[PDB]
């Protein structure tokens, strides 16, 4: 509830059908700004947000450069990770890494995180103290020991704390008009019935930005679906409760969002 910039990398081993798959997409808050796709035609870092389009060639050449290094690195990792676990070259496996910095209301550093995962589980993650690491397997400790000898941990700390927040503050200003904006949730409710003695009272929060929001019911027995994006920068989410009959007045939905100074309490009336 301040600001952040996080990159996400996913490299999947495609055994026998070429090289792995790699996707590097960059996010500023809930807004995607750049991407890279193993199997794209451009093979350069592409813009996915207008405030990023303005960046000179030297930048794009820059990130494209750095992004593919991230690629070579990630295909080496897969091979290395297969060895540790003694897995057959047959099956496919996934590598995911994510790192970036968090910045407060003042655009000053707050946190940083590296962390990597193999086949959907945590492998190793940089401790909040950006000095230590959290190793998961005994294999993950190999990587930890090694990384501790090289002082990789302290080379990252310089990034999360330095160049990351800088480039983040730079992103927020350069794209201010979209990033530094909020959108109060456009709420409403519906009444559907399950049977002849039960009805599904549903509460909606649409067109809001950022994605953080709190949908809450109250007369335990509440369906909540995960905040989904509408596709135009705003997000949606709804909450439902199977209310007994003629009992809909005793149910209140509550909305909480950065854009609502005071919450919205909407009742079926």
């Amino acid at each position: 509830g301040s600001h952040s910039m996080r990159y996400f990398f996913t490299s999947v081993s495609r055994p026998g059908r070429g090289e792995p798959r790699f996707i590097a997409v960059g996010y500023v808050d809930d807004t995607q700004f750049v991407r890279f796709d193993s199997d794209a035609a451009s093979q350069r870092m592409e813009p996915r947000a207008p405030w990023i389009e303005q960046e000179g060639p030297e930048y794009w050449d820059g990130e494209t450069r750095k992004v593919k290094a991230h690629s070579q690195t990630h295909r080496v990792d897969l091979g290395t990770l297969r060895g540790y676990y003694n897995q057959s070259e047959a099956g496919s496996h996934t590598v995911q890494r994510m790192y970036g910095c968090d910045v407060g209301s003042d655009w000053r550093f707050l946190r940083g995180y590296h962390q990597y995962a193999y086949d959907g589980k945590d492998y190793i993650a940089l401790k909040e103290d950006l000095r230590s690491w959290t190793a998961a397997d005994m294999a993950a400790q190999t990587t930890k020991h090694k990384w501790e000898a090289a002082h990789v941990a302290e080379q990252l700390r310089a990034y999360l704390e330095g160049t990351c927040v800088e480039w983040l503050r730079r992103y927020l200003e350069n794209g201010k008009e979209t990033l530094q904006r909020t959108d109060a949730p456009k709420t409403h409710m519906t009444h559907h019935a399950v049977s002849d003695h039960e009805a599904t009272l549903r509460c909606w929060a649409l067109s809001f930005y950022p994605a953080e929001i709190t949908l809450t019911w109250q007369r335990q027995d509440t369906e909540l679906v995960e905040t989904r994006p509408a596709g135009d920068g705003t997000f949606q989410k709804w909450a439902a409760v199977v209310v007994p009959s003629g009992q809909e007045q005793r149910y209140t939905c509550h909305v909480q969002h950065e854009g609502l100074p005071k919450p919205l309490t909407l009742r079926w009336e």
Binding site: I23, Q32, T94, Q96
Partner: protein, 100 residues
């Protein structure tokens, strides 16, 4: 490794108004592995001009993607989102319901 079935949400960008151009979406999320097939269906048939977000994943390493298509809703045309993943014995087809 850890397998997770995708959660599927078929909805429109803006509230469904027959006759008005809008976009149909399918935000498949919380799944693992990444290999997944998603197609938006119109009256059973496959929709060719669909687009999708780049692969990104959540805090729990589960992936998420958004498959949108530009469509001008009609009252009789039925719409759906067909999804297949190594965790489904058959391709889960969820029908678009304008009130869900």
């Amino acid at each position: 490794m850890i397998q997770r079935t995708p959660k599927i949400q078929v909805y429109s960008r803006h509230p469904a108004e027959n006759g008005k151009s809008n976009f149909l979406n399918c935000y498949v999320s919380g799944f693992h592995p990444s290999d997944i097939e998603v197609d938006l269906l119109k009256n059973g048939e496959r929709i060719e001009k669909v687009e999708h977000s780049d692969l990104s994943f959540s805090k729990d390493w589960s992936f998420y993607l958004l498959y949108y298509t530009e469509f001008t809703p009609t009252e009789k045309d039925e719409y759906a989102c067909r999804v297949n993943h190594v965790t489904l014995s058959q391709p889960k087809i969820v029908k678009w319901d304008r009130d869900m």
